[PDB]
Design a protein around this ligand. Structure first.
Ligand SMILES: [Cl-]
Ligand SMILES: [Cl-]
Length: 286
């Protein structure tokens, strides 16, 4: 369930993994294949919930799903496609979810309100080369909108070359929510540089560390598994490097997989995590 590498050995460890056409890397990534796989997704499968899943084969485990509150009238009114995920420090440091659908964006905001979320991380565009990935579930401008019993107002939007940071006020109290939208992930494969995602993660983590009251950080892409799991794994491992004498990429991904299917969905993303750590450690060493 873990594979901790001493920082001074990490360079050579990763070269070793990469030798003979990623021979041993592939072997290790495959060891993760089965983690979590005993767990059912019965609630997600109930007829009343079918329209609430973006992908009919990417569903939260019963044991770790986030539940919406309910009172009077409440079939599976408690359902959203979202899972609690541990971080470097505590259980439920994140909530991972699918890209909201037009028909579940009210549920999404209800969850953000009920869970005291102050930071949302989005690692997809809404449409990628014409394929719908996520509904545009926030306001397009500063004009307010209702989502269910909540009112949302976008107070600010700061567009940078690789991500956009929005701030919303939500009234249900009123709270300030920041949205960190990474806008450059390639349509296929991982980002072209490690620096891009490293700098994005570092920026998000700065803000999270400035939100001590908050509930979990929401992270999503389209399905809430591959890019999302890579983002969370990188956030967790970068914190390891700052605190610790070793780094456990395998262990972070193992832990993510115990909580949601497919977290870090491709070997390419698993390689990218190693290349990110390799690059940070090279710069430190120097
Ligand atoms: Cl749920
Ligand atoms: Cl960790």
């Amino acid at each position: 369930t873990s594979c901790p590498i001493k920082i001074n050995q990490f360079e050579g460890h990763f070269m070793k993994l990469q030798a003979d056409s990623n021979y041993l890397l592939s072997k290790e990534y495959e060891e993760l294949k089965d983690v979590g796989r005993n767990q059912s997704c019965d609630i997600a499968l109930l007829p009343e919930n079918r329209g609430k899943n973006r992908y009919n084969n990417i569903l939260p485990y019963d044991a770790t799903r986030v539940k919406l509150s309910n009172v009077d009238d409440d079939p599976c009114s408690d359902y959203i496609n979202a899972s609690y995920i541990p971080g470097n420090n505590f259980r439920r440091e994140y909530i991972v979810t699918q890209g909201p659908l037009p028909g579940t964006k009210d549920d999404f905001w209800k969850m953000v309100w009920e869970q005291n979320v102050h930071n949302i991380v989005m690692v997809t565009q809404c449409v990628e080369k014409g394929r719908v990935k996520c509904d545009h579930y926030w306001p397009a401008d500063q004009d307010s909108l209702y989502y269910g019993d909540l009112i949302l107002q976008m107070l600010s939007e700061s567009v940078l070359p690789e991500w956009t940071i929005r701030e919303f006020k939500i009234c249900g109290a009123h709270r300030l929510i920041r949205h960190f939208h990474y806008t450059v992930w390639p349509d296929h494969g991982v980002p072209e540089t490690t620096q891009s995602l490293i700098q994005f993660v570092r920026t998000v983590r700065d803000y999270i560390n400035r939100s001590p009251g908050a509930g979990p950080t929401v992270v999503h892409c389209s399905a809430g598994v591959g890019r999302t799991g890579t983002f969370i794994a990188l956030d967790r491992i970068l914190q390891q490097l700052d605190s610790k004498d070793s780094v456990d990429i395998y262990g972070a991904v193992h832990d993510l997989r115990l909580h949601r299917v497919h977290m870090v969905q491709t070997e390419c993303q698993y390689v990218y995590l190693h290349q990110c750590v390799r690059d940070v450690l090279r710069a430190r060493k120097l």
